[PDB]
Write a structure and sequence with these properties.
Chains A, B: It comes from Hevea brasiliensis (Para rubber tree). Chains A, B: One of its GO terms (biological process) is jasmonic acid metabolic process. Chains A, B: It holds the Pfam family Abhydrolase_1. Two copies of one chain form a homodimer. Chain A has 256 residues and is an alpha/beta fold. Chain A has one domain: Alpha/Beta hydrolase fold, catalytic domain (Rossmann fold), CATH 3.40.50. Chain A has eleven helices and nine strands. In chain A, the strands form two sheets. Chain A has a six-stranded parallel beta sheet with strand order 2-1-3-4-8-9, sandwiched between helices. Chain A has a three-stranded antiparallel beta sheet with strand order 5-6-7. The longest helix of chain A has 14 residues.
């Protein structure tokens, strides 16, 4: 079967991280949308203009809003992308056929929206050469960050080719986790985000979203289907594109 | 010998078009800078804010200005990049060891700054699915354009892989030739832009900067050294990276 995949990137990144997966998925007959979230990729906004994960999630929300009644899509988020998914699912669940998590965070409904973000910081406390800053928005102080080049090379693009790593050093922009804001945000609902089929995809070779964390996430919130890719790194859509596409196909054939 | 290469991209593009060449050049021991010109790549400005090719060229100019006395670089421009080179050469020639033109426009000093741009439009009049618009800046009406996806696929990324073409559809932004502005701009000087060693690199397989035009350019303004790559397409830094790097090395060994 054919499906409409909406590929959601993580912070400090853009749609470009899907430059390989997108064409391959279409080569399978699928409709693929790769969105740029606020102040990400070639989006004209700057991070200082964003005041929350919800605002940051704007593009995805508007994309969904524009879908004609009856059309369902499959959201695919990577790393911090799972949060964008939960935010949208609580506003457009009828439109989501399923949601795939690609080495991503898996929020739940029993805890605050920052729960898994906080846990990640516990397992991966040292972001190496990453630098931070602070700006103010809507009376809240936000911690902005720009991913360190060494961190990218060693923990994110570990097994990626130099030509791919190069793109990261030329395209990654200032971003934010909006962690303190998430802490005060309303819990994701069980009726919306809770009702959607969730497929968790990961590799125990991820140098940042370490096994302890990802395994911790599966036990905390039991996914509907778990797929464990063998090998690769954090960026499986680059190091294991073919495999990922194989799974997405299986998902398209299972959920609609 | 080792050199500091400053890779200049063409309009509607960004530094990302050098994501392959850059790392390879360093693998050779060279210092490589890949700049994002105004409203290009992840530059925060929008084209409507730019009013001329000179403003558009800002980043390059500032990069040169920041070089400490005695440091020389080799400018490498592609396609419309040659214009950015002439603009800088008339302001920092002492700092330029040489300038390589990569399937680029070759401005001269006997004609107006738009001369070769106008000639290109004669040889390549149909930009297919490219769309245009107009905005006003400093009392001048400027014709903006966004490169058509078919044009990119068929004439620019002809032999490039789908994964590379994908990047273009996700990264190319609104741009402009500033052609009408160039027409009224002062002629490039013979003392500055004229004095610099110019190396012209091209392939007769370029589907947009056709042979008739490129050959026309070499006869019009005799380059110091001509290199004809066999095969590939317009984007030789993607289709013939290794070769290009071989030439750049030879250039670094010849000019300083």
């Amino acid at each position: 079967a054919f499906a409409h995949f909406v590929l959601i990137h993580t912070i400090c990144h853009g749609a470009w991280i899907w430059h390989k997966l997108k064409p391959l998925l279409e080569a399978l007959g699928h409709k693929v949308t790769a969105l740029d979230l606020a102040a990400s990729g070639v989006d004209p906004r700057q991070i200082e203009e964003i005041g929350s994960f919800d605002e940051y999630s704007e593009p995805l929300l508007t994309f969904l809003e524009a879908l004609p009644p009856g059309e369902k899509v499959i959201l695919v988020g990577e790393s911090c992308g799972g949060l964008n998914i939960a935010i949208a699912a609580d506003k457009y669940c009828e439109k989501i056929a399923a949601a795939v998590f690609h080495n991503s965070v898996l929020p739940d409904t029993e805890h605050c929206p920052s729960y898994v973000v906080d846990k990640l910081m516990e397992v991966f406390p040292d972001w190496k050469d990453t630098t931070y800053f602070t700006y103010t928005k809507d009376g809240k102080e936000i911690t902005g960050l720009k991913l360190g080049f060494t961190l990218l090379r060693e923990n994110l693009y570990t097994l990626c080719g130099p030509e791919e790593y190069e793109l990261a050093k030329m395209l990654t922009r200032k971003g934010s986790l909006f962690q303190n804001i998430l802490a005060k945000r309303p819990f994701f609902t069980k009726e919306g985000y809770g009702s959607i089929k969730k497929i968790y995809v990961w590799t125990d070779q991820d140098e940042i979203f370490l096994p302890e964390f990802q395994l911790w996430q599966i036990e905390n919130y039991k996914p509907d289907k778990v797929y464990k890719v063998e090998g690769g790194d954090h960026l499986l859509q680059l190091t294991k594109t073919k495999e990922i596409a194989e799974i997405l196909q299986e998902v398209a054939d299972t959920y609609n």
